[PDB]
Design a protein around this ligand. Sequence first.
Ligand SMILES: N#Cc1ccc(COC[C@H]2O[C@@H](n3c(NCc4ccc(Cl)c(Cl)c4)nc4c(N)ncnc43)[C@H](O)[C@@H]2O)cc1
Length: 377
Amino acid sequence: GPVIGIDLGTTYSCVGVFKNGRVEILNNELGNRITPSYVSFVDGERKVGEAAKLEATLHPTQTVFDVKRLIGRKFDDQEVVKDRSLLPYEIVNNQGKPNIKVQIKDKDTTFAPEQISAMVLEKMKEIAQSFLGKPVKNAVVTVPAYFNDAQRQATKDAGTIAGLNIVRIINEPTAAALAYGLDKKEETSILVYDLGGGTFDVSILVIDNGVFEVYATAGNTHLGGEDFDQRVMDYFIKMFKKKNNIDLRTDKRAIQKLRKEVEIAKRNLSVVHSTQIEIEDIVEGHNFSETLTRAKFEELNDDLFRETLEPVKKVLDDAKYEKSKIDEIVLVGGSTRIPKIQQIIKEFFNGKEPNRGINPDEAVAYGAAIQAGIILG
Ligand SMILES: N#Cc1ccc(COC[C@H]2O[C@@H](n3c(NCc4ccc(Cl)c(Cl)c4)nc4c(N)ncnc43)[C@H](O)[C@@H]2O)cc1
């Protein structure tokens, strides 16, 4: 039967199939190749993906996301304590493990992380089933290289709930290396720099005659594109207050509209130097109309961009590597499209040019689908 490839990310998932010798990254029911990893429990309905994410503004306690931060961890882990103080939905201690508590028709309902991740996996399964016109029972699913056995098993258990046998767990750096087709012959050391919406991971991957080994990994669990958007949000909220005596934070719908336009503006500024951020009646009778330049975008985020080098230094130090010891730099995650990110990486490595894909958001799912193809022969 078919084996599909799923990137189960922190902020999103992505599903690919291997069919007639080509990988096809599949569109969800809204036409998007990336699906936000959100699940909403509002008014007796359960939504998964973009429709769930839209519930977060008005139903923040009922809109579950970032469950990958909890999966296979313990409630008292330092990282989980920090995530409970950041996340707006209730997290409870179930026999030492974090569980998610929501209401369904007013009833308290408690889910293991893998039950929420299963709902994401079921949606990816259904996309694949509709496209292949046949049932899917098997998948390759990606994990972070730093995932321990409990985190990998909880991910497999998410698959089993979704009716997917996870025939192989591959780490995200290996998935990237397969996607970019890095030559498997002889020995190659690769720096995989993965800057997503919520998280930053960097790994040293060694490929030795077809055998992939991650020699070192480091990152920042709370550094991604969402943080760069928030820096912009913060600035324009201060400016709108200075000019108009309106604090946009007092209206959650206004903040939601601004965040959508700021995200688009950031993406524009990876290509152009100046963009307009425009919302008619951001509150009643008050338009939002601003210009953001690439220079000001960079100025607002310079410290966060340069923070990404701290984990790069750590993996080189952990592996006892010279910068020169790295043979190729590979970028994954949509945030690696920011020109300043590529410049800083290039300059840290004493001029060396990074390799970057053209669809860096899909590279991991693409490699998972390649691994599916490899397993079927
Ligand atoms: N929840 C959720 C969710 C929604 C979209 C994405 C994809 O992006 C991961 C990160 O990558 C960032 N990013 C992206 N990602 C591309 C992208 C954005 C939205 C969708 Cl639906 C898809 Cl097909 C792809 N492009 C960027 C660009 N041109 N310049 C700077 N940052 C860019 C994006 O802003 C985000 O922070 C990830 C998760």
